[model samples]
Target chain A: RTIVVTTILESPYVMYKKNHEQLEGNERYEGYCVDLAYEIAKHVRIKYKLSIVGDGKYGARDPETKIWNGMVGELVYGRADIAVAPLTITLVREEVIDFSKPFMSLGISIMIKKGTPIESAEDLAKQTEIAYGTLDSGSTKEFFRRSKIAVYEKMWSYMKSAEPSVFTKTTADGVARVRKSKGKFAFLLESTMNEYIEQRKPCDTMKVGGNLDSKGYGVATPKGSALGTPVNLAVLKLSEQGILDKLKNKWWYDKGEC
Target chain B: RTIVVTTILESPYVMYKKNHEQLEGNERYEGYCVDLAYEIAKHVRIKYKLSIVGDGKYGARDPETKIWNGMVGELVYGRADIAVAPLTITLVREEVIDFSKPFMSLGISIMIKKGTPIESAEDLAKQTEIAYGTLDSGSTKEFFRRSKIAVYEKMWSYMKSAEPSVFTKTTADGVARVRKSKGKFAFLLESTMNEYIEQRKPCDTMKVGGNLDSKGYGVATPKGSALGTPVNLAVLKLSEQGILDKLKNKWWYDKGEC
Candidate 1:
């Protein structure tokens, strides 16, 4: 059976190719996760189709209805056979889906315009001039909300009540705000994405501070599905073979703008 | 019934306390894993009795009988409900047991006695004057055996046929070999133990090389066991709460000898 691969449209993870109007199916996409998906599918000896989530957001649970949304919903609902995306492997997600060992490690990090005075989380926590916020309905925001550290406690306090509500609906929008705000905004996002944007055009944003906490993204499958076994093995085999590292270099730096 | 936790005797993950001769039950042991197991058990609200694996092995399958052994076998054979050791998470083990997301991340690394001529894996690989080996029946050894890279190919070849048989039965033996060999022998082990040993008595050893690769240690349970979820969630919660890092600092550096 051809696997139904669910992914997201995060730039550099899954992006539309320049001549995409003439391309079909997988041919239309080119990015980090695209290559990663191709590699994993081949190693697992499976044929697959890549489809973006109907809603572009990564999965989150609805507070009121207790329903899940995003790519996580696809897996949980049996709509996708596998998700070869940069889905964070968190406790909430792990309950409904099984993750292979991490394919990559990352953490929450601060992103700022190149010349911003901020250099660390404490720097931003103590300042009032720059308005910093995380992507809405994102893990980074949850990280701040749950953090017990004094600096993060104060910082989350500021963002929760900031004027005009500082959160952005998407990573692209948050990054866009940082680029257009003339150093007035700092976006807190995953280090994987933060590092990628620093190498792209305009290259005006830089990730500041050590990552707040380390975590990883994994190839995920439906909980208790037989598909989880072979895919997990294949991911580990790929990692052991250095294929994962090769793909990281191919997508992140070999084709980078800066 | 009290949850049965089958762990190993790897220090400083698990070890006897100085007054062990007079202690009984869980009081007899004290180490990083001891503290971690208590934290997880308390968070998951379970009563667990710690029992060291009967064979003192981390878990490996016998080639001929296809039977699992060590802490893994304890779970697979229904002798234990959980494992809270510093067990390496690998694909083969994942087939029979479930692991929470890594409570800790590490990688294979080279441990050299202070003043050893070697500085990295490549340096050790290129020279014959000094010798190195990994813990026997361990993932680190398997890493070398399965590796495809040029340097690893040569190094593993050297290790497999070394005249005296380079593999050690335990981590302590390997560390002892390095200390007593007086720069003639280097032991390859996980970075967590290496870093811990670097802070201990005599402190004659140091971890060299960027870790050969990255992997992690997770609390484990039998496949399809209900215990996996809350324990997994607890591990993630502890990590988010900064308890894991605090524990690391507590066990590794706070009580360090050197």
Candidate 2:
């Protein structure tokens, strides 16, 4: 039908219910954006049903082959009405879909073992000491690929050099690599994800430096839907009501720094 | 059924044929991003059809009424899979949907009658004589509205006042307003549009001001679309192949800039 909504299982956004592991479809998720999705569906005046994007595949594709392996692909194939995930905004994605104003703001910050020498995106971009890399399927990799300003553009040149490039396919994978590598790698992910990881036991990773750039956590929808206006207004209303803030706190942290 | 693609008719991107006044489908338009959309469709391997978004609307919404007046409405309502318009990537829109890597780079620049007394964004920000505004239903207005930066914050205040605060519903309207106002009205739009207008016969307008910010035009789809990967890969490939530049000249421009 025209009103169905689909989303992917990404941590802190949508994740499988551990207790209901075999429960496919809508029964599998619990996260902040999932709640927000329900509210957005209410505001946009639709009865949305959730489906795992691409049957639970994640974001990866062979550029030359053009085959997809993630949730980002489901929307491309017309399988979703909206997506409320910790999907970062990027120029590459803008070409195919539409994004609303930011509900949550974040930036690409560095994560490294507590005593790593690098402290900033600049520091990482400049030296080969830490062997910095980003989650392969997310926006940070694209940032390094497409950037054209100052040190970032230079970093992009190095990353795209067709040889032994340092990039992983997902944040979890990136996290694992950083952890097991025992201080040899630095990961770049959103502050929310970084903070969550930092709070865990045996937590060796800590986000360093201020964010590389200011970005927002947005809801994804099909391009040119009649619903954009109402939802966008809903977002503005939520911002005014501080409901958006409340949700962010409930989902990500108890408090946020200005 | 997850196969419809919604778009809009903007010059050089998608448009009616010279013979037809209205576009029935994707038959008549051509542009860098439009061609890029075709590439994305191929990568995702979906059966798709195109239609105009929100029946050809673009821009912000009224906060009190909670309504948007542009193609953005299409993406929100579930009428199409993605939107491939010359849409600007903004913080506000990012809050709702997913955008791709910028295929075309531009900025909101000031357009003044050739003899107007403005030198830059700085000059325009300080001006009191000329009545300045941006396209009513597009990104420029939103930028002014959402800015946290000082000058833009001040500009937004001036724009929102109860006077005959100026704003046009479309780029064409903005151009006509500039033409008829006899240099008293300045139009703020993306540099590409400004430059395009500057080359037309009357050529009465010239872009002024250093760009307030630089961003790119993207192909937007719904959030969490599995297609994000391939579509993004398409954009990156186009960038790598210089096909983006080729397409810009082929569809968006003529013998003008190339």
Candidate 3:
């Protein structure tokens, strides 16, 4: 039986090829996650089809309805057999789905335009001169909203009520804002994405400051799915043999432009 | 040819031994810095004498008098052939003396009484509820006073003019203030000392955030001293051979109490 893998299109993780019009099936896309999915499928001795979620999002639970959305929804509602994306394993997500051991580790990081005076989150928190925010939906947003940690909670109070609103709906939108805001804006994002963008063309943005919190991404399956154990074991075996490290170097540093 | 090594007595770095009554010379002291000095001396093939700084302060230049004091002064004025301690290498110090490549790496960090609400420097900056400060004459304090970074500059303004004076004279005093403040105070100190305190008995304090800046502790010498080259080469050789990592594990984690 073939497994249906639902993922989101996030650059460096999953992206459409430039000549996609000529490609079909899995050939339509490639990235770190795509390669990771291929390896896991090969090792687990299973066939799979990679599919993108209907809605582009990292996933979140709606406050009023308490229903999951995005790739998480696809897995929880059984629309897909698994989610192979940059899906962060948070406590809230864990309640509704089974996550294999983390396949990637990352944390919330600060993104700044070159020559910006801001160096640390504390620097941003102490002044009104520079503006900053995280993606409107995802673990990063949730981290600030529900955080009891003083720095995050304080930032939350500020961002939650800033005059122009600090939240953005997409990482791309946030990155654009940072690029265009002169030296007045900073974007908070995951370290992996921040590092990826820093090495891309027009390398004017830099990842500054240590991460706010540490978390990992896992291959998510519907609760009690039989595939969870094998997928987790495969990731562990790959990690033990340094395949994960090799893949990270391949995707993150091999083609570094800056 | 005794090489005069001007250092300071700091716990976990350099401290008088329990049976000091029967010991003389370097044998009277035992700690991380002491062992480090021994290793460098052995590697460089130099005979040295370890002497504590007369002023008991980490060096700083007096603004009005333009006089250097502490271990740095000893090196500047030719009173000591070398200065071996947790002497942070900074741009200001570089003007008057030479430093070997950092013998150990460290950065400024926050030390809080366990159970405090503060998690980062930004948290402390946003409120008047908790008071914080750094050792009066160290790189941690200098970082704030001289930083152009907005967050640090704002924090410097607050600390510089804080009521009751936030600055302390030494790390011991700062650690004591943190312990006795009943969660009302936090000390900004080097990560090495912060980590050392966190593992000690009574463990009422913990490191709460990432460092504000990245720097290293270097072997210091008077300007243009011939000893600089051989000492730096020795340090590089030790680092390349993984001796630095081994020494860190021996001191920091081997006797970790908590």
Candidate 4:
């Protein structure tokens, strides 16, 4: 049986090859996660077909209906055999879905148009000059909302009550606003994405401050799925072989624009 | 039945408190791992006792005898209920022991006397005037020995055959060599310990490079143990609650003297 691997259609993770118009199936996409999916399937000895997730979100449950959405919902409901995106390993998600040990690590970080005066989250929380926000319906937003630590809790209070609604519908929009907002806006995002953008064209932005937190992204599967065992071992093998580091370099630096 | 947590009698993770001579049982110990063990037991609702592991090694299987040693052995042979130490989550160890999501993340880092001129692993690899070594039987040593990456493999080649035996029997000895070698020796240890030592008095040494690799330390249990589920969830809760970060600051910094 061909296992269906669910992933997000996002940059440097899973995205269209420039010439994807002529390609079919998996060849149509190429990025860090595409390569990771290939390596995982090879090591796990399973044939998999890559499919973009339906909802385009990572995974969150609606309050009205406790049903999950995004790649996570696919795993929880069994629509996908595995999720090989940059989905975070978090508390509530782990209760319902299984994750291999994290294949990648990142933290929430600040991105600003170059020359922005902010150096840390504390800077953002203490001032009103530079507006800041996060991707709507994502882990970064959730972290701030859930954080009880003083600086973070204060930042969350400011963001949730800001007049302009500091949340964006997509990572691209948040970054785009930072690029165009001059020095007046800073975007909060996962360091992986923030760094990737720093290396992209029109390199007018930079990631500032130490990462606000530390966590990892894992190859997720359904709760109690038999596949978790082999997949977990495979990830360990790949990590030990240094393949994950190589992939990060291949997509994030060797292929970098700036 | 009491859950017996096996840990190393190492400083900053587990160590005798200042007045340990008059104390008994778990009260004799106080450090990051001790507090962490306390949290896990409270949250998981387990009656527990802490015991230092025999032989003072972090479990490595003997190629000759095929028997595991250290805290890992305690879990593998069902002699202990859990392991709460800086036990690295590695490939070989994971196969025999189930690990919770990493409670703390770290990587191999360079501990150099304050004046050593090295800035990165490549710098160390290119020169021989400054000798470097890892704890003789620890995961950092194993990483170099088992690595297939170019620089790491080259480093392993040099360390394995270097004259006068650069390896040390323990982390303390390795750091001591760096402190006394007067810029002639550098120690490769986990960044957590390096960071901890950086905050210590007689602060004559410094971490001089980015970590050599990425990984974490996890709470381990015997394979297929029922305690795995509760312990893993409990760790996630502590991480989210700011307790883990608080513990790190409390032990590594608040108590530090430079």
Which numbered prediction scores highest in TM-score against the true structure? 4
lDDT (tens digit, per residue) of candidate 2 on A161-185: 6245678877788888888876878
User: Local error of candidate 3 at A151, Å?
Assistant: 1.8
State the lDDT of candidate 4 residue by residue for B16-85, as single tens digits.
Answer: 9899999999999998999999999999998999988887778989999999999999999999989999
**What tens-digit string does per-residue lDDT give for candidate 1 at A33-73?**
89888888887888999998998877889999998898999
Error of 1 at A157 (Å): 0.6
Mind giving the per-residue lDDT tens digits that candidate 4 earns over A65-88?
998999999999989989999999
Per-model lDDT: 0.89, 0.69, 0.83, 0.91
- Ranked by TM-score from best down, the candidates are 4, 1, 3, 2
Model 1 CA deviation exceeding 4 Å by range: A114-119, A176-185, A201-204, A255-258, B114-119, B180-184, B256-258
Regions of candidate 4 where Cα sits further than 4 Å from its true position: none
- What local lDDT score does residue B45 receive in model 4, on the 0 to 100 scale? 95
**TM-score of predicted structure 3, chain A:** 0.97
The candidates, ranked best first by DockQ, are 4, 1, 2, 3
Candidate 1, A192: how far from true, in Å? 1.4
lDDT of 3: 0.83
Give the B-chain TM-score of model 1.
0.97
- Model 1: fnat (fraction of native contacts): 0.52
Candidate 1, residues B1-258, lDDT tens digits: the string is: 799999878777889999999999999998889999999989889888999888878888999999998999999999999999889988788878898889999989989998988888899889888989998888898899988899999999999999798889888899999999979999998999999989998878998878888888989999878888888889888887889888888889997899
B24-115: candidate 3 lDDT, tens digit per residue: 99899988788888988998899999999988877889989999999989998889999888888665676578776566766689999999
DockQ of each: 0.54, 0.03, 0.01, 0.77
Q: Write model 2 residue lDDT over B44-115, tens digit each, in one string.
A: 776667766655665456689876556566666555667777888764666666666566767789889889
